[PDB]
Amino acid sequence: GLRHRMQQLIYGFFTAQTLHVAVRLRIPDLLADGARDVGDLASATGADAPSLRRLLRALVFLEVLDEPAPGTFALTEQGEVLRADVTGSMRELVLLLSGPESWAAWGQLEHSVRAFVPTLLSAYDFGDLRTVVDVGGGSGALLAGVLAAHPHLRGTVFDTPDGVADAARTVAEQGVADRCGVETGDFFVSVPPGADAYVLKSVLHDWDDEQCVEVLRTVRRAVRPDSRVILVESLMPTTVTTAPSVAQVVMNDLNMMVCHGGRERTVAEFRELLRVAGFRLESVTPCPAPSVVGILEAA
Amino acid sequence: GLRHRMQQLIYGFFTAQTLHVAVRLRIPDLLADGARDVGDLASATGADAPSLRRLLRALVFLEVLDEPAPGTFALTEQGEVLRADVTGSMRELVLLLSGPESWAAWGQLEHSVRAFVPTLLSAYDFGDLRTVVDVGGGSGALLAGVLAAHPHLRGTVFDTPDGVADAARTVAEQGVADRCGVETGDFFVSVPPGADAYVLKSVLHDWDDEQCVEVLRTVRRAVRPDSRVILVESLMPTTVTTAPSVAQVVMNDLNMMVCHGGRERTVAEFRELLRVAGFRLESVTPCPAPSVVGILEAA
Ligand SMILES: [Hg+2]
Ligand SMILES: [Hg+2]
């Protein structure tokens, strides 16, 4: 009853590995149309055959596959997610299992000792606005959509090249011929714009904790005041905590505690982070229940 | 809905690691009586405090703990299993997370390319028997209980010393003064006993696959025929497969596919394994539903 849960929790390496190594020679793709026996399977693989059997079972146990009749096997609609289609939730497993991630997390205890594009932002409403300045835009994803959205508003970007700086045919492509106003360089530089509203997308997500404080020191040391600082982020459940859903926040906090930087602040951990770093709270507003996406907005 | 399952399956490293590193400075033990705040907690640990918070959460998410009021935390009856009491299901996590196990499984894909004591055996019934010979006994666990059980039956063992060979005060301790008849050495040696019944406990469990064949070649090349070869084992679901329970077999197969040797044969994979290795099937009989423990018995 309870042990069941604990083991199931404690045996995560098993569960984790088996899926990666199933898509590793994309097993599902063989069974998308259909494939039977371990023998027909083992031809188009390499590996062992009667010690590959010991994996088909493991999959079938984890419910990703299902042997309908003795030996011979099919796959489940969960196992449908692993082909490279609609979701293609297998790139996910591939990166979360190669030594880059899987071997890194092995010694993660020590660290405890030591293409998104919001039209959600068209519920903030830039509906009396002339200028904006996207801080560390990079791709030209929002910038496009937002200056596309509001035909009279204009804008600016600043990111170093070699940080997804393929703006070339994206601020240009799709209408915004004027209103690129593009700059270069880091966010660690004191930002020369003093022009209406300021936008920072899923960016503490990238940052550390007092990295966030000093990149926001670099704004209000020469922000044009009496205007709005937007920052869109994933938050962390200050709502309460719970089990179901939520998840993504928790084990991406620890993922980025290992795989590069990122940590997750709650509501109040942004309020105090702003109040000392020269910013003043105002309203906050999330996405619907399926996500944690939150448009923060302090003055 | 489904993604939920897949992620939950694919994110096993997270789940796996967090529990080990919670008992690693036995957090639960602090909260068995009671402990509050991250600050009182962090004194009796080391580590960080506001980057230890990022773990308490993770535990509380995985439901092992539960923060009742802002910050301050308690633990759950699942988290009760991790202290070192009744079950003490934390030694489990400690060995399944240190580099010996956790780092070993990291590259386990390649391998795919390349104190129990049955009174259950007092349902086989030695109830017309005089002699027995426990093959590779070692500890003197059954030998004791069984020659203790039946006052007139007598027996023998053979195991190399330095393989839990603390028989000294166990065949002796608890009544069986006579009927030790103890020998030494490997099972790879041709076994000199030709004396009634032969017993092999959870031993393919230890073995490989054709290691099993030749250690049973070493029996019938000089077994006294017309008698019974007992071997007690964990089987593998030839019943069907399923999800709930079962589990232990599946991810101990792969555990021993990494952590030393062991693989799991089903019913028919023992029948053919015996039929060529000079043994003849007869009855099989398991433990109840909670386990897979099976007393095989071929003539
Ligand atoms: Hg990664
Ligand atoms: Hg181990």
Numbering used by the authors:
A (entry chain A), B (entry chain A): 11 to 124, 162 to 346
Paper excerpt:
Protein CalO6 from the CAL gene cluster was originally proposed to catalyze one or both O-methylations (at positions C2 and/or C3) of this moiety. Methyltransferases of this family consist of three domains: the N-terminal helical domain is responsible for the dimerization via domain swapping, the central helical domain forms a lid over the active site, and the C-terminal Rossmann-fold domain bears a SAM binding motif and the catalytic residues, and forms a part of the substrate-binding pocket. Examples of such methyltransferases include caffeic acid O-methyltransferase from perennial ryegrass, human N-acetyl serotonin O-methyltransferase, as well as chalcone and isoflavone O-methyltransferases from alphalpha. It is proposed that the catalysis in these enzymes occurs through the activation of the hydroxyl group to be methylated through abstracting its hydrogen by a catalytic His residue in the enzyme active site (His252 in CalO6).
An example of challenging structure determination, CalO6, a dimeric Dnrk family O-methyltransferase, was crystallized in the absence of a cofactor or a substrate. The crystal structure of CalO6 was determined by a combination of molecular replacement by using diffraction data collected with native crystals with single anomalous dispersion (SAD) using an EMP derivative, as described in Materials and Methods. Locations of all mercury sites were consistent with covalent Cys modification. Crystals of CalO6 belong to space group R32, with one monomer in the asymmetric unit. The entirely helical N-terminal domain of CalO6 (residues 1 to 105) is involved in dimerization, and the C-terminal Rossman-fold domain (residues 162 to 356) containing the SAM-binding motif, is involved in substrate binding and the catalysis of the transfer of the methyl group from SAM onto a hydroxyl group of the substrate. A normally helical region between these two domains (residues 106 to 161; called a middle domain in some studies), which forms a part of the substrate-binding pocket in other methyltransferases, is disordered and not visible in the electron density map (as indicated by a dashed line in Fig. 4a). As a consequence, the substrate-binding pocket in CalO6 is much more open than in other O-methyltransferase structures. The N-terminal domain is oriented at a different angle with respect to the catalytic domain from that seen in other methyltransferases bound to SAM, opening the active site even further.
